[PDB]
Amino acid sequence: SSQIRQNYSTEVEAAVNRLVNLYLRASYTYLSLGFYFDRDDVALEGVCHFFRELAEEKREGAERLLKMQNQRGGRALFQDLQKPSQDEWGTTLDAMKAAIVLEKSLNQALLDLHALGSAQADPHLCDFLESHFLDEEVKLIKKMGDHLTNIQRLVGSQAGLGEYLFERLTLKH
Amino acid sequence: SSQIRQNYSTEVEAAVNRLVNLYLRASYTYLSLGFYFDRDDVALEGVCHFFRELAEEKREGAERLLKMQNQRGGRALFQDLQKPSQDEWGTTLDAMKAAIVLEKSLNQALLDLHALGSAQADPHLCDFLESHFLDEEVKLIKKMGDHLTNIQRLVGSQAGLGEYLFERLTLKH
Amino acid sequence: SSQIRQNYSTEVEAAVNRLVNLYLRASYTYLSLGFYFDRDDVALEGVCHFFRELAEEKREGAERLLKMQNQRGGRALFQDLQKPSQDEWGTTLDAMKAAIVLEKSLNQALLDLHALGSAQADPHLCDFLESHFLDEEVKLIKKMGDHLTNIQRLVGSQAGLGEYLFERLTLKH
Amino acid sequence: SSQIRQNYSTEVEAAVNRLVNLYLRASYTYLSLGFYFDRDDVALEGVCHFFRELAEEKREGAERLLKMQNQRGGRALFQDLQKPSQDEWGTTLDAMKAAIVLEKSLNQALLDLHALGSAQADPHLCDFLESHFLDEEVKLIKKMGDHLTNIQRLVGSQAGLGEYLFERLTLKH
Numbered sequence: 097s098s099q100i101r102q103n104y105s106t107e108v109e110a111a112v113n114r115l116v117n118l119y120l121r122a123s124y125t126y127l128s129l130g131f132y133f134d135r136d137d138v139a140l141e142g143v144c145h146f147f148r149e150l151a152e153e154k155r156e157g158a159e160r161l162l163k164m165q166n167q168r169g170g171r172a173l174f175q176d177l178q179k180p181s182q183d184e185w186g187t188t189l190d191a192m193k194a195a196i197v198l199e200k201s202l203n204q205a206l207l208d209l210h211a212l213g214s215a216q217a218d219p220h221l222c223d224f225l226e227s228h229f230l231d232e233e234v235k236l237i238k239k240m241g242d243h244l245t246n247i248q249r250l251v252g253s254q255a256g257l258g259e260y261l262f263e264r265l266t267l268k269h
Numbered sequence: 270s271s272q273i274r275q276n277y278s279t280e281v282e283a284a285v286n287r288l289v290n291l292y293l294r295a296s297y298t299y300l301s302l303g304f305y306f307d308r309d310d311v312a313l314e315g316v317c318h319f320f321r322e323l324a325e326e327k328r329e330g331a332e333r334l335l336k337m338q339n340q341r342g343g344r345a346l347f348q349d350l351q352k353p354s355q356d357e358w359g360t361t362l363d364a365m366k367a368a369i370v371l372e373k374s375l376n377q378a379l380l381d382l383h384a385l386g387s388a389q390a391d392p393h394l395c396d397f398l399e400s401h402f403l404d405e406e407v408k409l410i411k412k413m414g415d416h417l418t419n420i421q422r423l424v425g426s427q428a429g430l431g432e433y434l435f436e437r438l439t440l441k442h
Numbered sequence: 443s444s445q446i447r448q449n450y451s452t453e454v455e456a457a458v459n460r461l462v463n464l465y466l467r468a469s470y471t472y473l474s475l476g477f478y479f480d481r482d483d484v485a486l487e488g489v490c491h492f493f494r495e496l497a498e499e500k501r502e503g504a505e506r507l508l509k510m511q512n513q514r515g516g517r518a519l520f521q522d523l524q525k526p527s528q529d530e531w532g533t534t535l536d537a538m539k540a541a542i543v544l545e546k547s548l549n550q551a552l553l554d555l556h557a558l559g560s561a562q563a564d565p566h567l568c569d570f571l572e573s574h575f576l577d578e579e580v581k582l583i584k585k586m587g588d589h590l591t592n593i594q595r596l597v598g599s600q601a602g603l604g605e606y607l608f609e610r611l612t613l614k615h
Numbered sequence: 616s617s618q619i620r621q622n623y624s625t626e627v628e629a630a631v632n633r634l635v636n637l638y639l640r641a642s643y644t645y646l647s648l649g650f651y652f653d654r655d656d657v658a659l660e661g662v663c664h665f666f667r668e669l670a671e672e673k674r675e676g677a678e679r680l681l682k683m684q685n686q687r688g689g690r691a692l693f694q695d696l697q698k699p700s701q702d703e704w705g706t707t708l709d710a711m712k713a714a715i716v717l718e719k720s721l722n723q724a725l726l727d728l729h730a731l732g733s734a735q736a737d738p739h740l741c742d743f744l745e746s747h748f749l750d751e752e753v754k755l756i757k758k759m760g761d762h763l764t765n766i767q768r769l770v771g772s773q774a775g776l777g778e779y780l781f782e783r784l785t786l787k788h
């Protein structure tokens with residue numbers, strides 16, 4: 097491919113491009129989740145901020161993958177970005193469940209790429225994912241699960257009241 | 270009218286005087302809303318502060334209109350100020366709905382003056398309203414709508430509890 | 443649509459959603475332009491930084507449109523994001539010409555939305571575009587044109603040499 | 616071997632000693648490259664500094680390997696250091712190509728040691744190489760490739776002029 101490319105399979109190169117597309121899709125999903133909670137008829141500004149911050153983190157993930165692709169001598173290829181799965185996201189409970197599902201899918205794609213790298217004997221790819229993605233995803237998913245449990249505990253008691261309290265007393269605003 | 274007056278119609282001059290009267294009326298309404306929430310039998314001090322601050326903003330709006338009237342070479346004319354529409358304002362929900370209606374009426378008067386200025390080819394009037402009124406009104410109305418949604422969410426759960434929480438955890442105090 | 447919506451046409455609401463999609467498309471295009479110049483076989487890091495910064499500005503444009511859509515009581519709707527028009531962008535000259543074409547298309551969409559707002563008598567939309575988009579686009583397009591002229595002057599003399607010099611002595615790095 | 620040695624194969628111990636010899640050889644090569652560019656008849660002081668800094672980094676690599684060898688309870692063994700492959704290194708283009716070849720050979724030796732560690736089930740060796748060598752080598756090789764492209768772009772235009780410009784405007788001096 098390149099003067100610099102060394103030990104970098106076409107299979108990993110393509111899988112990295114696909115991972116960029118997944119991260120950018122996830123970023124777009126979080127942009128939609130954030131602006132839904134800014135609606136005047138939803139108006140949970142801590143929830144909007146929580147998802148806007150995730151939008152930024154997923155775009156920064158994609159950018160780190162793209163930097164690595166060029167450092168390896170691979171070639172970035174972009175594809176269309178599919179729109180998010182919903183236009184309206186329901187309650188904070190519904191939204192957090194959607195978010196966990198999303199992150200679990202990202203985490204499965206990271207694990208699938210790690211396994212490809214291991215099959216291709218590409219230790220720099222495995223190190224990169226271990227250094228910058230896999231621990232961050234486990235930590236995020238635990239935080240989301242904690243939030244889900246707290247929202248569940250709250251909305252089981254009194255849904256509107258509970259959703260307000262969660263936004264006010266757990267989420268940053 | 271004046272050594273300085275230029276491109277400033279009698280129709281806009283009169284409409285500006287009427288707008289001053291509307292802004293001062295709105296200021297008076299917010300003074301009544303604020304002191305109602307300071308009643309010992311209502312006692313929502315964040316709500317009182319929210320409306321007292323709006324009272325001040327509407328009087329500052331009127332004063333900016335008056336400064337502009339004199340900068341254009343128009344003549345300020347004051348009329349009686351009608352008392353606010355209610356003597357007691359109900360719950361925080363009722364009060365916020367009254368406030369949104371009030372602001373929407375101010376915003377319609379601004380839009381009507383903008384349209385007059387455009388019909389009279391008065392771009393300094395249009396710039397002035399765009400610079401100092403129209404965006405501020407859209408922003409305020411969105412904030413009020415956000416508050417309304419949060420109060421609704423709260424009082425649908427448990428009215429007294431919800432009203433206390435909103436005052437404590439959304440409004441500044 | 444909403445408790446707050448006032449003077450906000452369905453035609454402008456839809457056109458704003460389309461403008462968000464154009465700005466996000468442009469952001470994606472600039473992401474591809476930036477990472478192309480980071481290729482080891484292209485390696486113009488000031489050019490990469492110039493387009494990455496534009497990527498960020500166009501995503502911030504989209505986010506400002508989305509905030510305004512919610513402030514007006516419109517509803518954000520997202521569509522698929524088409525991939526950029528090229529996978530490889532040629533020389534700095536070719537890339538800057540692509541970028542000017544892109545910005546001129548954004549500027550035409552802004553002008554078309556301004557004209558719709560004027561036809562719908564929506565002065566808050568016109569103020570918003572005048573305050574935050576139209577001057578910034580004219581300024582950017584002039585800068586790009588200046589760059590284009592300098593690159594042309596350089597590559598007409600000695601293409602590789604000239605492209606290096608432009609990157610080193612005009613672009614930030 | 617030792618009171619402390621645990622899970623540390625003789626095969627990895629020997630391969631580490633060989634890697635020390637390769638890193639010290641590379642350090643010596645970069646010392647020769649640096650002083651060649653300090654010749655009065657070559658006189659590219661940014662190029663001299665670039666290779667002297669690499670000389671230092673490769674000796675620090677060797678020293679880190681030696682510290683790890685002792686931390687594992689292996690025994691350092693030193694062999695003769697072969698002289699660099701050339702006495703005169705040509706142009707900056709020629710020198711950077713020599714340097715990339717050198718670094719690719721170091722990177723292949725690191726990958727070969729990683730594979731040995733994986734075959735021997737030595738995760739501390741794999742972690743050590745991933746923490747301190749493999750990412751640094753990928754980053755260095757990308758930088759060198761970027762430099763190579765820029766030098767090529769320059770010397771294709773006007774060789775002496777281009778080499779001066781690269782030294783002056785890319786390399787630190």
Ligand SMILES: [Cl-]
Pocket residue numbers: 104105106107
């Ligand atoms: Cl392959």
Ligand SMILES: [Cl-]
Pocket residue numbers: 176525
């Ligand atoms: Cl396509």
Ligand SMILES: [Cl-]
Pocket residue numbers: 219222223226745
């Ligand atoms: Cl690993």
Ligand SMILES: [Cl-]
Pocket residue numbers: 141269
């Ligand atoms: Cl806020």
Ligand SMILES: [Cl-]
Pocket residue numbers: 277278279280
């Ligand atoms: Cl007149």
Ligand SMILES: [Cl-]
Pocket residue numbers: 349
């Ligand atoms: Cl009277």
Ligand SMILES: [Cl-]
Pocket residue numbers: 392395396399
């Ligand atoms: Cl105007």
Ligand SMILES: [Cl-]
Pocket residue numbers: 314442
């Ligand atoms: Cl107090």
Ligand SMILES: [Cl-]
Pocket residue numbers: 450451452453
């Ligand atoms: Cl309509």
Ligand SMILES: [Cl-]
Pocket residue numbers: 179522
């Ligand atoms: Cl679709």
Ligand SMILES: [Cl-]
Pocket residue numbers: 399565568569572
């Ligand atoms: Cl305007």
Ligand SMILES: [Cl-]
Pocket residue numbers: 487615
């Ligand atoms: Cl840099």
Ligand SMILES: [Cl-]
Pocket residue numbers: 623624625626
């Ligand atoms: Cl052994």
Ligand SMILES: [Cl-]
Pocket residue numbers: 695
């Ligand atoms: Cl010997």
Ligand SMILES: [Cl-]
Pocket residue numbers: 738741742745
């Ligand atoms: Cl490892």
Ligand SMILES: [Cl-]
Pocket residue numbers: 660788
């Ligand atoms: Cl010196």
